[PDB]
Amino acid sequence: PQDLSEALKEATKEVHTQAENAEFMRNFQKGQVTRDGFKLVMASLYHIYVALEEEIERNKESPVFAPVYFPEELHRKAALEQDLAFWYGPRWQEVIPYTPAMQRYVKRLHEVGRTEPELLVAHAYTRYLGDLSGGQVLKKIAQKALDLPSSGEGLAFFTFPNIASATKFKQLYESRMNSLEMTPAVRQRVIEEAKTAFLLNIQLFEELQELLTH
Ligand code: HEM
């Protein structure tokens, strides 16, 4: 494939379907999701985005990332902080779980962000773009199966307020990725890192499913 974005999308088709097939994600799609299962996914997201956005801020000016740096449009941490306060309460920071599978994901993120900056774009792509184009469908489901009250909170994560049009921003971000110059070596590694990203989510889904079936 010519474009890195077109290359990524095609190289991760397999793992993505694999992601959709995961037991946890299947039940989620089959409208089957519990408050406890949803809390774990939000807790996970908070840990993942904290680490990811921590590393993006460290490589904000680097030529290997600057092109896809859109902090106001994409930051999710603040939104998740708001959400976890609703799901876990005022003391959420003390009680939210931080599991081994979440730590594995968080660890690879810090590693790439500290010793392989040129691969960070692979994680920002997988997370941000994935949650943006598939966000609505994923939220639509959850909010029905959750039948939560109407306190006006708990799902801020699924809404990117600083993005007027998801499609127009998607194409813009892709454009910026395709503008990134890299050796075929690096490019191949970025492609790999994206596949790796999907595997870190899949094993995470496996673990969460395990924790909820005792
Ligand atoms: C379990 C089922 C999931 C559903 C139902 C779902 C749904 C969606 C939808 C509706 C799209 C739109 C098609 C497109 O953008 O090309 C999409 C794209 C994508 N998803 Fe998923 N997704 C799931 C899980 C995940 C996971 C675990 C990740 C990884 C964090 C992920 C990463 C992506 C990426 C990166 C794209 C955009 C690729 C591109 O077009 O360049 N998705 N997803």
Swiss-Prot record:
Residues that, per the record, bind heme b: 9, 16, 125, 174
Predominant subcellular localization, coarse grouping: endoplasmic reticulum
An example Gene Ontology biological process: positive regulation of smooth muscle cell proliferation
E.C. number: 1.14.14.18
UniProt KW keywords: Apoptosis, Endoplasmic reticulum, Heme, Host-virus interaction, Iron, Membrane, Metal-binding, Oxidoreductase, Phosphoprotein, Transmembrane, Transmembrane helix
GO CC terms of this entry: cytosol; endoplasmic reticulum; endoplasmic reticulum membrane; extracellular space; membrane; mitochondrial outer membrane; nucleoplasm; nucleus
Entry GO MF terms: enzyme binding; heme binding; heme oxygenase (decyclizing) activity; identical protein binding; metal ion binding; protein homodimerization activity; structural molecule activity
Residues of the site described as Important for catalytic activity: 131
EC category: oxidoreductase
Membrane topology: Single-pass type IV membrane protein
The record's account of how the chain is modified after translation: A soluble form arises by proteolytic removal of the membrane anchor.
Tissue distribution of the protein: Expressed at higher levels in renal cancer tissue than in normal tissue (at protein level).
Free-text note regarding domains: The transmembrane domain is necessary for its oligomerization.
Family under the similarity heading: Belongs to the heme oxygenase family.
Quaternary structure, from the entry: (Microbial infection) Interacts with SARS-CoV-2 ORF3A protein; the interaction promotes ORF3A-induced autophagy but is unlikely to be involved in ORF3A-mediated induction of reticulophagy. Homodimer and higher order homooligomer. Oligomerization is crucial for its stability and function in the endoplasmic reticulum. Interacts with FLVCR2; this interaction is potentiated in the presence of heme.
Annotated disorder: Heme oxygenase 1 deficiency: A disease characterized by impaired stress hematopoiesis, resulting in marked erythrocyte fragmentation and intravascular hemolysis, coagulation abnormalities, endothelial damage, and iron deposition in renal and hepatic tissues. Clinical features include persistent hemolytic anemia, asplenia, nephritis, generalized erythematous rash, growth retardation and hepatomegaly.
Protein name: Heme oxygenase 1
Species name: Homo sapiens
Residues shown, of full length: 10 to 223 of 288
